[PDB]
């Protein structure tokens, strides 16, 4: 995350930490995403795209660190690796980019809610707020475009959303902004989500209840002048999401 500040796992407790084994036994991080219901991560599909084998992958829950180990974390094994089948990326943009992973503990169990550990709702179908909204990003992503490590701790940030309307115009990304996208940013230009954060949760109130708006899926760089976050909008998936954790 570009700005914001650092938080712990307890603050967005639905937040889930993938990883990818490689095969001289190093294991480096690949995206984030959001515990819906018990066994089920909602993440984004262009982090396993390169390398779609379920057996690669470990999600851990309670995870308020990038590459030690916090007290309250449960890590599991991927059972179900579901990307977007019409799925697709151009330049930029990434089309219908959402995943599911399925969790189960080498025991067998899935994902036992704790202080550390929670699921989020899902919104109604095409329930969105309105433009304008403040909203909450997470994840291990890095605090500046240029570097080249992530942050050991987990950041989070608040941004507003951007009208659909406001999306498109050239100015900003213009015609590869679709109404299943989702754009936020901040007024200011200075906080955003960046690499790394993609598959993590863009966090809206609705209902009174902490609402999975968005999956982290693209930008043009991280925080700059006049090219928001764009999300892949959840309201717009939920038949999807309903039908492939039935
Ligand atoms: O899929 C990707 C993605 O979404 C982002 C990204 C860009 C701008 C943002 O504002 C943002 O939140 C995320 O970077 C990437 C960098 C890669 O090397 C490969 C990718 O596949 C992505």
Redesign the pocket.
């Known amino acids: 995350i570009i700005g914001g500040e650092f938080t712990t796992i307890e603050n967005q407790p639905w937040f889930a930490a993938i990883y990818r084994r490689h095969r001289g036994g190093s294991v480096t991080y690949v995206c984030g995403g959001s515990l819906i219901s018990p066994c089920w991560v909602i993440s984004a599909t262009?982090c396993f795209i390169d390398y779609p084998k379920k057996e690669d992958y470990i999600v851990y829950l309670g995870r308020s660190r990038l590459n030690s180990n916090t007290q309250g974390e449960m890590k599991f094994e991927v059972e179900n690796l579901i990307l977007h089948k019409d799925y697709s990326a151009d330049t930029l943009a990434?089309h219908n980019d959402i995943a599911l992973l399925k969790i189960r503990s080498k025991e067998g169990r899935c994902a036992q809610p704790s202080r550390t550990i929670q699921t989020i709702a899902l919104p109604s179908m095409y329930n969105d707020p309105q433009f304008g909204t403040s909203c909450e990003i997470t994840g291990f992503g890095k605090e500046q475009s240029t570097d080249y490590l992530y942050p050991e701790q987990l950041k989070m940030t608040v941004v507003k959303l951007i009208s659909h309307r406001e999306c498109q115009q050239p100015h900003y990304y213009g015609s590869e902004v679709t109404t299943k996208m989702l754009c936020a940013a901040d007024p200011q230009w200075k906080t955003?989500?960046?690499?790394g954060?993609?598959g993590g949760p863009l966090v809206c109130s609705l209902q009174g209840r902490m609402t999975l708006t968005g999956i982290?899926?693209?930008?043009?760089?991280?925080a700059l002048k006049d090219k928001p976050?764009v999300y892949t909008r959840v309201s717009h998936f939920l038949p999807w999401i309903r039908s492939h954790t039935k």
């Not at 955003?192 to 690499?195: A, E, F, L």
């Not at 982290?216 to 991280?222: L, P």
């Open positions: 262009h990434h955003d989500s960046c690499q954060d993609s982290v899926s693209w930008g043009r760089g991280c976050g």
